[PDB]
């Protein structure tokens, strides 16, 4: 039922302007984070621009910031991309992207990680597929890095060193990374999702008795959030920078086929912009 339909692509002269539209159906655009991507042949797709669900933050890749501006039309349930000072290298298929299923968890994750360094394993980096704005992104891999926009490290010790002298480091997944950082963690930020879903990755088997809950907030399933969910912050009974943040369904399920099973990603059909 969720549909994203882009229009507005055209042939434009260098230095010209264009406005793209994405007509959305099946969800209200002003209540989800929305992103634009583009892809030219022989190149990987790249994130272009995004706006947070709350509408209080927008982010752009360096080559388009200022030139491009993202906007959401409430009455038309449509997302726009205004594009100025267009260059031949802007030639690409442009399309919108949205995650649906549990937007409250993604807002909670953003609120609790902005302006902190995040550490993730290579599989989680591939699943997210874009640098998280406003955070230093640190990727664990035993192999050389493959993206200049983030910091690649080859060990737990290198990952922590790359965070520098900060008050808090957020470890954001996935299962293998959580297993190694849980014994160093002083705090767990957990979203518990009341969903029975198949998983191939689980959060590590921590002992609830060894943790004290200092924050607990219950929420109901609603029109946007498919299942009841709760936010919890635990502190280790009896100091350090490391915190884990994770969303757990029933039986500590966190992933399936390199995605979160309660999250559904949708992509538009694309519209071709040609600058010649
Ligand atoms: N909150 C949630 O519910 C979350 C769920 N997930 C889910 O987790 C799943 C992925 O988790 P998982 O499959 O365990 O993969 P991870 O995301 O933990 O990444 C694993 C990779 O990280 C690298 N790595 C791990 N430890 C080290 C180390 N000490 N030194 C160097 N490199 C290291 C290796 O990369 P290499 O092979 O290149 O060496 C390894 O293959 C996905 O389904 C994702 O959706 C992810 C994040 C949050
Ligand atoms: C920002 O979008 C994503 C974020 C995360 C990590 C994550 C998401 N939610 C919570 N509570 N903790 C986390 N560590 C994981 C993701 O997919 C695995 C994401 O893409 C949907
Ligand atoms: Cl969202
Ligand atoms: Cl990207
Ligand atoms: Cl290590």
UniProtKB/Swiss-Prot annotation:
Binding site for NADP(+): 123-124, 141-142, 154, 173-180, 247, 253-259
PROSITE patterns hit by this protein: DHFR_1, DHFR_2
This protein's UniProt keywords: Antibiotic resistance, Methotrexate resistance, NADP, One-carbon metabolism, Oxidoreductase, Trimethoprim resistance
Gene3D superfamilies the record matches: Dihydrofolate Reductase, subunit A
GO biological process terms, semicolon-separated: 10-formyltetrahydrofolate biosynthetic process; dihydrofolate metabolic process; folic acid biosynthetic process; folic acid metabolic process; one-carbon metabolic process; response to antibiotic; response to methotrexate; response to xenobiotic stimulus
One CC-aspect GO term: cytosol
Enzyme class: oxidoreductase
Miscellaneous field: The strain K12 sequence is shown.
Family: Belongs to the dihydrofolate reductase family.
Function: Key enzyme in folate metabolism. Catalyzes an essential reaction for de novo glycine and purine synthesis, and for DNA precursor synthesis.
Identification of the protein by name: Dihydrofolate reductase
Species this chain originates from: Escherichia coli (strain K12)
């Amino acid at each position: 039922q969720v549909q994203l339909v882009e229009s507005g692509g055209a042939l434009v002269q260098p230095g010209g302007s264009l406005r793209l539209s994405c007509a959305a159906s099946g969800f209200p655009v002003n209540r989800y984070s929305m992103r634009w991507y583009r892809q030219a042949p022989g190149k990987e797709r790249e994130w272009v621009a995004g706006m947070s669900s709350a509408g209080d933050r927008s982010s752009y890749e360096d080559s388009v910031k200022g030139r491009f501006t993202i906007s959401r039309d409430d009455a038309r349930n449509t997302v726009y991309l205004q594009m100025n000072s267009l260059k031949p290298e802007d030639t690409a298929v442009y399309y919108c992207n949205v995650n649906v299923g549990l937007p409250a968890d993604l807002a909670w994750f953003k609120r609790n990680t902005l302006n902190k360094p995040v550490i993730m394993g290579r599989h989680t980096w591939e699943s997210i597929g874009r640098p998280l704005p406003g955070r230093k992104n640190i990727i664990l891999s035993s192999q050389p890095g493959t993206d200049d926009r983030v910091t690649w490290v080859k060990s737990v010790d290198e990952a922590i060193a790359a965070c520098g002298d900060v008050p808090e480091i957020m470890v954001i997944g996935g299962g293998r990374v959580y297993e190694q950082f849980l014994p160093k963690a002083q705090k767990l930020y957990l979203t518990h999702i009341d969903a029975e879903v198949e998983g191939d990755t689980h959060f590590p088997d921590y002992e609830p008795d060894d943790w004290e809950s200092v924050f607990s907030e219950f929420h109901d399933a609603d029109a946007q959030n498919s299942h009841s969910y709760c936010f919890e912050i635990l502190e280790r009974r009896g100091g350090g920078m490391i915190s884990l943040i994770a969303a757990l369904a029933v039986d500590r399920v966190i992933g399936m086929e390199n995605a979160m099973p309660w999250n559904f990603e949708y992509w538009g059909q694309g519209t071709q912009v040609t600058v010649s």
